[PDB]
Design a protein around this ligand. Structure first.
Ligand SMILES: CCCCCCCCCCCCCCCCCC(=O)OC[C@H](COP(=O)([O-])OCC(O)COP(=O)([O-])OC[C@@H](COC(=O)CCCCCCCCCCCCCCCCC)OC(=O)CCCCCCCCCCCCCCCCC)OC(=O)CCCCCCCCCCCCCCCCC
Ligand SMILES: CCCCCCCCCCCCCCCCC[C@@H](O)O[C@H](CO[C@H](O)CCCCCCCCCCCCCCC)COP(=O)(O)OCC[N+](C)(C)C
Lengths: 122, 175
Protein backbone atom coordinates (compact mmCIF):
# COMPACT_ATOMS: atom_id res chain seq x y z
CA UNK A 1 0.00 0.00 0.00
CA UNK A 2 1.10 3.56 -0.74
CA UNK A 3 0.65 5.76 2.33
CA UNK A 4 1.08 9.20 0.77
CA UNK A 5 1.24 8.52 -2.96
CA UNK A 6 -2.17 10.09 -3.47
CA UNK A 7 -2.24 12.88 -0.93
CA UNK A 8 -4.72 15.52 -2.05
CA UNK A 9 -3.23 18.55 -3.81
CA UNK A 10 -0.02 16.75 -4.69
CA UNK A 11 1.77 17.83 -7.89
CA UNK A 12 2.84 14.71 -9.86
CA UNK A 13 6.55 15.22 -10.51
CA UNK A 14 7.46 18.26 -8.40
CA UNK A 15 10.17 16.93 -6.01
CA UNK A 16 9.81 20.10 -3.92
CA UNK A 17 6.38 21.66 -3.30
CA UNK A 18 5.99 25.34 -2.54
CA UNK A 19 4.84 24.67 1.04
CA UNK A 20 8.26 23.10 1.70
CA UNK A 21 9.63 26.66 1.62
CA UNK A 22 8.06 27.16 5.07
CA UNK A 23 10.65 24.82 6.60
CA UNK A 24 14.13 25.79 7.78
CA UNK A 25 16.68 24.75 5.15
CA UNK A 26 19.45 22.36 6.20
CA UNK A 27 22.64 24.09 7.25
CA UNK A 28 25.61 23.88 4.90
CA UNK A 29 27.56 22.32 7.79
CA UNK A 30 24.94 19.59 8.22
CA UNK A 31 26.68 16.34 9.25
CA UNK A 32 24.62 14.53 6.61
CA UNK A 33 25.94 16.95 3.97
CA UNK A 34 29.47 16.33 5.24
CA UNK A 35 28.85 12.60 4.84
CA UNK A 36 27.66 13.16 1.26
CA UNK A 37 30.88 15.07 0.59
CA UNK A 38 32.85 12.21 2.13
CA UNK A 39 31.05 9.82 -0.23
CA UNK A 40 32.09 12.01 -3.15
CA UNK A 41 35.69 12.04 -1.96
CA UNK A 42 35.66 8.24 -1.71
CA UNK A 43 34.22 8.02 -5.23
CA UNK A 44 37.09 10.18 -6.47
CA UNK A 45 39.68 8.04 -4.69
CA UNK A 46 38.21 4.86 -6.18
CA UNK A 47 38.18 6.54 -9.59
CA UNK A 48 41.92 7.15 -9.25
CA UNK A 49 42.47 3.58 -8.02
CA UNK A 50 40.66 1.85 -10.89
CA UNK A 51 42.32 4.02 -13.55
CA UNK A 52 45.75 3.17 -12.04
CA UNK A 53 46.59 6.76 -11.10
CA UNK A 54 48.19 8.09 -7.89
CA UNK A 55 45.24 7.67 -5.57
CA UNK A 56 45.53 10.73 -3.36
CA UNK A 57 46.85 13.38 -5.76
CA UNK A 58 46.03 12.30 -9.33
CA UNK A 59 43.23 14.62 -10.36
CA UNK A 60 42.26 17.43 -8.03
CA UNK A 61 39.74 18.96 -10.43
CA UNK A 62 38.03 15.58 -10.83
CA UNK A 63 38.03 14.91 -7.08
CA UNK A 64 36.63 18.39 -6.48
CA UNK A 65 33.86 17.76 -9.00
CA UNK A 66 33.00 14.47 -7.26
CA UNK A 67 32.74 16.20 -3.88
CA UNK A 68 30.79 19.16 -5.27
CA UNK A 69 28.26 17.03 -7.15
CA UNK A 70 27.63 14.80 -4.14
CA UNK A 71 27.13 17.80 -1.84
CA UNK A 72 24.90 19.57 -4.37
CA UNK A 73 22.61 16.57 -4.78
CA UNK A 74 22.60 15.83 -1.06
CA UNK A 75 21.37 19.32 -0.18
CA UNK A 76 18.16 18.93 -2.19
CA UNK A 77 17.78 15.32 -1.09
CA UNK A 78 17.88 16.47 2.54
CA UNK A 79 15.36 19.22 1.82
CA UNK A 80 12.92 16.73 0.30
CA UNK A 81 13.39 14.22 3.13
CA UNK A 82 12.84 16.85 5.82
CA UNK A 83 9.74 18.14 4.04
CA UNK A 84 8.31 14.64 3.71
CA UNK A 85 8.78 13.91 7.43
CA UNK A 86 7.22 17.29 8.26
CA UNK A 87 4.20 16.32 6.13
CA UNK A 88 3.88 13.01 7.98
CA UNK A 89 3.92 14.82 11.33
CA UNK A 90 1.42 17.43 10.14
CA UNK A 91 -1.05 14.81 8.91
CA UNK A 92 -0.71 12.65 12.03
CA UNK A 93 -1.33 15.59 14.38
CA UNK A 94 -4.27 16.84 12.32
CA UNK A 95 -5.86 13.38 12.27
CA UNK A 96 -5.45 12.96 16.02
CA UNK A 97 -7.07 16.37 16.48
CA UNK A 98 -9.99 15.50 14.19
CA UNK A 99 -10.68 12.08 15.79
CA UNK A 100 -10.82 12.71 19.56
CA UNK A 101 -12.90 9.60 20.31
CA UNK A 102 -10.12 7.43 18.84
CA UNK A 103 -7.31 8.93 20.98
CA UNK A 104 -9.00 9.48 24.35
CA UNK A 105 -7.06 11.45 26.95
CA UNK A 106 -6.62 9.13 29.94
CA UNK A 107 -6.22 10.35 33.50
CA UNK A 108 -3.08 8.67 34.81
CA UNK A 109 -2.75 6.98 38.18
CA UNK A 110 0.38 7.36 40.30
CA UNK A 111 2.66 4.46 41.18
CA UNK A 112 1.35 4.59 44.74
CA UNK A 113 -2.04 3.41 43.46
CA UNK A 114 -0.96 0.95 40.76
CA UNK A 115 -0.46 -2.63 41.95
CA UNK A 116 2.52 -4.22 40.23
CA UNK A 117 3.37 -7.84 40.93
CA UNK A 118 6.71 -8.47 42.61
CA UNK A 119 8.85 -11.36 41.36
CA UNK A 120 11.71 -12.11 43.77
CA UNK A 121 15.09 -13.10 42.36
CA UNK A 122 16.34 -16.04 44.41
CA UNK B 1 40.64 11.16 68.67
CA UNK B 2 38.45 14.03 67.43
CA UNK B 3 38.44 12.48 63.94
CA UNK B 4 35.19 10.57 64.42
CA UNK B 5 32.04 10.91 66.49
CA UNK B 6 32.26 8.90 69.71
CA UNK B 7 28.47 8.55 69.91
CA UNK B 8 28.30 6.59 66.64
CA UNK B 9 31.46 4.54 67.41
CA UNK B 10 31.32 3.97 71.18
CA UNK B 11 33.60 1.96 73.45
CA UNK B 12 33.76 1.23 77.20
CA UNK B 13 35.76 3.56 79.47
CA UNK B 14 38.99 1.49 79.16
CA UNK B 15 39.85 0.31 82.67
CA UNK B 16 43.58 -0.46 82.87
CA UNK B 17 45.15 -2.08 85.96
CA UNK B 18 48.10 -0.41 87.61
CA UNK B 19 51.41 -2.33 87.55
CA UNK B 20 51.89 -4.17 90.85
CA UNK B 21 55.24 -5.99 90.71
CA UNK B 22 55.95 -8.72 93.25
CA UNK B 23 59.44 -9.97 92.33
CA UNK B 24 62.69 -8.01 92.42
CA UNK B 25 63.76 -9.18 88.96
CA UNK B 26 63.97 -6.48 86.27
CA UNK B 27 61.11 -6.31 83.81
CA UNK B 28 62.44 -6.73 80.24
CA UNK B 29 59.22 -5.29 78.80
CA UNK B 30 59.78 -2.01 80.66
CA UNK B 31 63.36 -1.70 79.39
CA UNK B 32 62.25 -2.48 75.85
CA UNK B 33 59.38 0.03 76.12
CA UNK B 34 61.78 2.77 77.23
CA UNK B 35 64.10 1.89 74.34
CA UNK B 36 61.18 1.97 71.88
CA UNK B 37 60.01 5.36 73.15
CA UNK B 38 63.47 6.90 73.04
CA UNK B 39 64.47 5.45 69.64
CA UNK B 40 61.21 5.07 67.68
CA UNK B 41 58.35 7.17 69.04
CA UNK B 42 60.25 10.43 69.56
CA UNK B 43 61.57 10.81 65.97
CA UNK B 44 58.12 9.85 64.67
CA UNK B 45 56.44 12.58 66.74
CA UNK B 46 59.08 15.10 65.66
CA UNK B 47 58.50 14.33 61.98
CA UNK B 48 54.73 14.43 62.47
CA UNK B 49 54.86 17.79 64.20
CA UNK B 50 57.00 19.18 61.37
CA UNK B 51 54.41 17.90 58.89
CA UNK B 52 51.65 19.56 60.93
CA UNK B 53 53.45 22.92 61.01
CA UNK B 54 53.75 22.70 57.24
CA UNK B 55 50.04 21.86 56.98
CA UNK B 56 48.94 24.71 59.25
CA UNK B 57 50.60 27.23 56.92
CA UNK B 58 48.12 26.27 54.22
CA UNK B 59 44.51 25.79 55.23
CA UNK B 60 41.63 24.97 52.92
CA UNK B 61 38.33 23.16 53.36
CA UNK B 62 36.22 20.65 51.51
CA UNK B 63 32.47 20.51 52.04
CA UNK B 64 30.17 17.56 52.55
CA UNK B 65 27.53 17.75 49.84
CA UNK B 66 23.93 18.35 50.84
CA UNK B 67 21.15 16.94 48.66
CA UNK B 68 17.58 18.21 48.61
CA UNK B 69 14.66 15.86 49.18
CA UNK B 70 12.64 15.16 46.01
CA UNK B 71 9.32 13.28 45.56
CA UNK B 72 9.57 9.50 45.68
CA UNK B 73 8.32 6.89 43.22
CA UNK B 74 4.91 6.71 44.91
CA UNK B 75 4.00 10.25 43.83
CA UNK B 76 5.13 9.77 40.21
CA UNK B 77 2.63 9.19 37.44
CA UNK B 78 2.85 6.08 35.29
CA UNK B 79 4.79 7.49 32.33
CA UNK B 80 6.32 10.69 33.73
CA UNK B 81 9.96 9.93 32.97
CA UNK B 82 11.49 12.96 34.71
CA UNK B 83 9.90 12.41 38.12
CA UNK B 84 10.68 8.70 37.80
CA UNK B 85 14.31 9.60 37.11
CA UNK B 86 14.60 11.89 40.13
CA UNK B 87 12.81 9.43 42.41
CA UNK B 88 15.06 6.58 41.25
CA UNK B 89 18.22 8.61 41.83
CA UNK B 90 17.07 9.52 45.33
CA UNK B 91 16.17 5.88 46.00
CA UNK B 92 19.64 4.74 44.90
CA UNK B 93 21.29 7.27 47.21
CA UNK B 94 19.11 6.08 50.11
CA UNK B 95 20.06 2.46 49.32
CA UNK B 96 23.76 3.36 49.51
CA UNK B 97 23.23 5.17 52.81
CA UNK B 98 21.41 2.13 54.22
CA UNK B 99 24.30 -0.11 53.16
CA UNK B 100 26.69 2.14 55.07
CA UNK B 101 24.39 2.12 58.13
CA UNK B 102 24.57 -1.68 58.16
CA UNK B 103 28.35 -1.35 57.74
CA UNK B 104 28.61 0.87 60.83
CA UNK B 105 26.57 -1.57 62.91
CA UNK B 106 28.71 -4.49 61.71
CA UNK B 107 31.89 -2.61 62.65
CA UNK B 108 30.48 -2.08 66.14
CA UNK B 109 29.75 -5.81 66.40
CA UNK B 110 33.25 -6.82 65.29
CA UNK B 111 34.95 -4.35 67.63
CA UNK B 112 32.86 -5.59 70.56
CA UNK B 113 33.75 -9.22 69.83
CA UNK B 114 37.46 -8.46 69.72
CA UNK B 115 37.43 -6.17 72.76
CA UNK B 116 35.51 -8.37 75.17
CA UNK B 117 37.87 -11.35 75.01
CA UNK B 118 36.51 -14.62 76.37
CA UNK B 119 33.31 -12.96 77.64
CA UNK B 120 32.09 -11.75 74.24
CA UNK B 121 29.04 -14.05 74.18
CA UNK B 122 27.61 -12.14 77.15
CA UNK B 123 29.17 -8.67 76.84
CA UNK B 124 28.17 -8.17 73.18
CA UNK B 125 24.43 -8.81 73.56
CA UNK B 126 23.53 -5.20 72.75
CA UNK B 127 25.62 -5.14 69.57
CA UNK B 128 24.22 -8.47 68.39
CA UNK B 129 20.69 -7.21 69.13
CA UNK B 130 21.24 -3.97 67.19
CA UNK B 131 22.66 -5.88 64.24
CA UNK B 132 19.74 -8.32 64.26
CA UNK B 133 17.20 -5.49 63.96
CA UNK B 134 19.15 -3.55 61.34
CA UNK B 135 19.73 -6.74 59.34
CA UNK B 136 16.03 -7.64 59.50
CA UNK B 137 15.00 -4.19 58.26
CA UNK B 138 17.60 -4.19 55.45
CA UNK B 139 16.51 -7.68 54.39
CA UNK B 140 12.88 -6.58 54.35
CA UNK B 141 13.77 -3.52 52.28
CA UNK B 142 16.18 -4.81 49.64
CA UNK B 143 16.33 -8.59 49.72
CA UNK B 144 15.55 -10.48 46.47
CA UNK B 145 15.41 -7.46 44.16
CA UNK B 146 18.12 -9.06 42.04
CA UNK B 147 20.19 -7.50 39.27
CA UNK B 148 18.24 -4.71 37.57
CA UNK B 149 16.70 -3.52 40.84
CA UNK B 150 14.75 -0.27 40.96
CA UNK B 151 12.46 1.82 43.13
CA UNK B 152 9.43 0.38 41.32
CA UNK B 153 10.34 -3.18 42.26
CA UNK B 154 10.98 -2.11 45.85
CA UNK B 155 7.56 -0.45 45.92
CA UNK B 156 5.93 -3.60 44.55
CA UNK B 157 7.70 -5.69 47.19
CA UNK B 158 6.53 -3.36 49.96
CA UNK B 159 2.96 -3.39 48.66
CA UNK B 160 2.96 -7.19 48.58
CA UNK B 161 4.28 -7.26 52.15
CA UNK B 162 1.60 -4.82 53.35
CA UNK B 163 -1.09 -6.91 51.67
CA UNK B 164 0.25 -9.97 53.47
CA UNK B 165 0.28 -8.07 56.78
CA UNK B 166 -3.27 -6.81 56.24
CA UNK B 167 -4.53 -10.32 55.51
CA UNK B 168 -2.70 -11.69 58.57
CA UNK B 169 -4.18 -8.94 60.76
CA UNK B 170 -7.68 -9.57 59.41
CA UNK B 171 -7.24 -13.29 60.15
CA UNK B 172 -6.34 -12.60 63.79
CA UNK B 173 -9.27 -10.23 64.38
CA UNK B 174 -11.78 -12.98 63.52
CA UNK B 175 -10.77 -15.11 66.52
C1 LIG C 1 32.66 4.07 10.44
C2 LIG C 1 33.92 4.11 9.59
C3 LIG C 1 34.56 5.50 9.57
C4 LIG C 1 35.64 5.66 8.49
C5 LIG C 1 35.46 4.68 7.31
C6 LIG C 1 36.78 3.98 6.94
C7 LIG C 1 36.59 2.87 5.86
C8 LIG C 1 37.39 3.16 4.60
C9 LIG C 1 37.17 4.61 4.10
C10 LIG C 1 35.95 4.71 3.16
C11 LIG C 1 36.23 4.03 1.81
C12 LIG C 1 37.55 4.53 1.16
C13 LIG C 1 37.64 4.18 -0.34
C14 LIG C 1 38.71 5.03 -1.07
C15 LIG C 1 40.09 4.35 -1.06
C16 LIG C 1 40.33 3.49 -2.30
C17 LIG C 1 41.75 3.68 -2.84
C18 LIG C 1 42.63 2.42 -2.63
O1 LIG C 1 42.34 1.41 -3.19
O2 LIG C 1 43.76 2.48 -1.78
C19 LIG C 1 45.01 2.31 -2.43
C20 LIG C 1 45.89 3.50 -2.04
C21 LIG C 1 47.37 3.12 -2.18
O3 LIG C 1 47.81 3.48 -3.48
P1 LIG C 1 49.12 4.51 -3.61
O4 LIG C 1 49.51 4.98 -2.21
O5 LIG C 1 48.76 5.70 -4.47
O6 LIG C 1 50.39 3.69 -4.30
C22 LIG C 1 50.56 2.32 -3.94
C23 LIG C 1 50.00 1.45 -5.11
O7 LIG C 1 48.70 1.89 -5.40
C24 LIG C 1 49.94 -0.06 -4.76
O8 LIG C 1 48.58 -0.46 -4.74
P2 LIG C 1 48.21 -1.98 -5.28
O9 LIG C 1 46.90 -1.94 -5.99
O10 LIG C 1 49.28 -2.45 -6.23
O11 LIG C 1 48.11 -3.03 -4.00
C25 LIG C 1 47.38 -4.24 -4.17
C26 LIG C 1 46.24 -4.26 -3.16
C27 LIG C 1 45.23 -3.16 -3.51
O12 LIG C 1 44.03 -3.43 -2.82
C28 LIG C 1 43.43 -2.27 -2.24
O13 LIG C 1 43.88 -1.20 -2.44
C29 LIG C 1 42.19 -2.43 -1.33
C30 LIG C 1 41.21 -1.27 -1.47
C31 LIG C 1 39.96 -1.50 -0.60
C32 LIG C 1 38.64 -1.34 -1.39
C33 LIG C 1 37.64 -0.42 -0.64
C34 LIG C 1 36.18 -0.77 -0.98
C35 LIG C 1 35.25 0.45 -0.91
C36 LIG C 1 35.06 0.95 0.53
C37 LIG C 1 34.17 0.01 1.36
C38 LIG C 1 34.61 -0.06 2.84
C39 LIG C 1 33.55 -0.77 3.75
C40 LIG C 1 33.50 -0.17 5.18
C41 LIG C 1 32.80 -1.11 6.21
C42 LIG C 1 33.80 -1.92 7.08
C43 LIG C 1 34.34 -3.17 6.39
C44 LIG C 1 35.76 -2.98 5.84
C45 LIG C 1 36.08 -3.96 4.72
O14 LIG C 1 45.59 -5.50 -3.21
C46 LIG C 1 45.78 -6.29 -2.05
O15 LIG C 1 46.61 -5.99 -1.26
C47 LIG C 1 44.90 -7.55 -1.80
C48 LIG C 1 44.41 -7.63 -0.36
C49 LIG C 1 42.96 -8.11 -0.24
C50 LIG C 1 42.38 -7.86 1.16
C51 LIG C 1 40.84 -7.68 1.14
C52 LIG C 1 40.36 -6.44 1.93
C53 LIG C 1 40.00 -5.25 0.99
C54 LIG C 1 38.83 -4.39 1.52
C55 LIG C 1 39.20 -3.61 2.82
C56 LIG C 1 38.82 -2.11 2.75
C57 LIG C 1 39.17 -1.34 4.05
C58 LIG C 1 39.36 0.19 3.82
C59 LIG C 1 40.52 0.50 2.85
C60 LIG C 1 41.48 1.58 3.40
C61 LIG C 1 42.08 2.44 2.27
C62 LIG C 1 43.02 1.63 1.35
O16 LIG C 1 45.62 3.85 -0.71
C63 LIG C 1 45.66 5.25 -0.47
O17 LIG C 1 46.68 5.83 -0.50
C64 LIG C 1 44.35 6.00 -0.17
C65 LIG C 1 43.75 5.59 1.18
C66 LIG C 1 42.98 6.75 1.84
C67 LIG C 1 43.56 8.12 1.43
C68 LIG C 1 43.74 9.08 2.61
C69 LIG C 1 44.08 10.51 2.15
C70 LIG C 1 43.58 11.59 3.14
C71 LIG C 1 44.70 12.58 3.54
C72 LIG C 1 44.53 13.09 4.99
C73 LIG C 1 43.44 14.17 5.12
C74 LIG C 1 43.19 14.61 6.59
C75 LIG C 1 41.68 14.74 6.90
C76 LIG C 1 41.40 15.74 8.03
C77 LIG C 1 41.82 17.18 7.66
C78 LIG C 1 42.42 17.93 8.84
C79 LIG C 1 43.82 17.42 9.20
C80 LIG C 1 44.58 18.39 10.11
C1 LIG D 1 22.06 3.35 -3.45
C2 LIG D 1 21.28 4.68 -3.22
C3 LIG D 1 20.24 4.96 -4.35
C4 LIG D 1 20.87 5.75 -5.54
C5 LIG D 1 19.76 6.37 -6.46
C6 LIG D 1 20.35 7.07 -7.74
C7 LIG D 1 21.15 8.39 -7.40
C8 LIG D 1 20.90 9.52 -8.45
C9 LIG D 1 19.53 10.28 -8.20
C10 LIG D 1 18.54 10.16 -9.40
C11 LIG D 1 18.18 11.58 -10.00
C12 LIG D 1 16.64 11.76 -10.25
C13 LIG D 1 15.88 12.11 -8.93
C14 LIG D 1 15.60 13.64 -8.78
C15 LIG D 1 15.23 14.33 -10.14
C16 LIG D 1 13.76 14.91 -10.13
C17 LIG D 1 12.79 14.04 -9.24
C18 LIG D 1 11.29 14.30 -9.55
O1 LIG D 1 11.17 14.66 -10.87
O2 LIG D 1 10.54 13.11 -9.32
C19 LIG D 1 9.84 13.10 -8.11
C20 LIG D 1 10.18 11.82 -7.33
O3 LIG D 1 11.34 12.06 -6.53
C21 LIG D 1 12.09 10.89 -6.32
O4 LIG D 1 11.26 9.88 -5.86
C22 LIG D 1 13.20 11.16 -5.27
C23 LIG D 1 14.56 10.57 -5.74
C24 LIG D 1 15.59 10.46 -4.58
C25 LIG D 1 16.29 9.06 -4.56
C26 LIG D 1 17.22 8.89 -3.32
C27 LIG D 1 16.57 7.99 -2.21
C28 LIG D 1 17.49 6.78 -1.80
C29 LIG D 1 16.99 6.07 -0.49
C30 LIG D 1 17.95 6.31 0.75
C31 LIG D 1 19.33 5.56 0.58
C32 LIG D 1 20.55 6.55 0.76
C33 LIG D 1 20.89 7.30 -0.57
C34 LIG D 1 21.90 8.48 -0.36
C35 LIG D 1 22.73 8.77 -1.65
C36 LIG D 1 24.25 8.82 -1.36
C37 LIG D 1 8.34 13.07 -8.39
O5 LIG D 1 7.69 12.43 -7.29
P1 LIG D 1 6.40 11.41 -7.62
O6 LIG D 1 6.11 11.40 -9.10
O7 LIG D 1 5.18 11.90 -6.88
O8 LIG D 1 6.77 9.86 -7.16
C38 LIG D 1 6.76 8.85 -8.18
C39 LIG D 1 6.67 7.45 -7.48
N1 LIG D 1 5.37 7.29 -6.75
C40 LIG D 1 4.20 8.11 -7.13
C41 LIG D 1 4.96 5.88 -6.94
C42 LIG D 1 5.65 7.56 -5.31
Amino acid sequence: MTMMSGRPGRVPLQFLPNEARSLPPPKLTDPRLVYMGFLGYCSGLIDNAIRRRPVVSAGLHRQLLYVTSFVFFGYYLLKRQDYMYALRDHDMFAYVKSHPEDFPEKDKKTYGEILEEFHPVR
Amino acid sequence: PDSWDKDVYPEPPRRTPAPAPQTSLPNPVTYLTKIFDLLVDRPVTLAREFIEQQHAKNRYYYYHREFRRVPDITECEEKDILCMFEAEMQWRRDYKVDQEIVNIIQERLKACQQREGESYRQNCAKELEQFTQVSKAFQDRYSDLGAHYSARKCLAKQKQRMLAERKAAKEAAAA
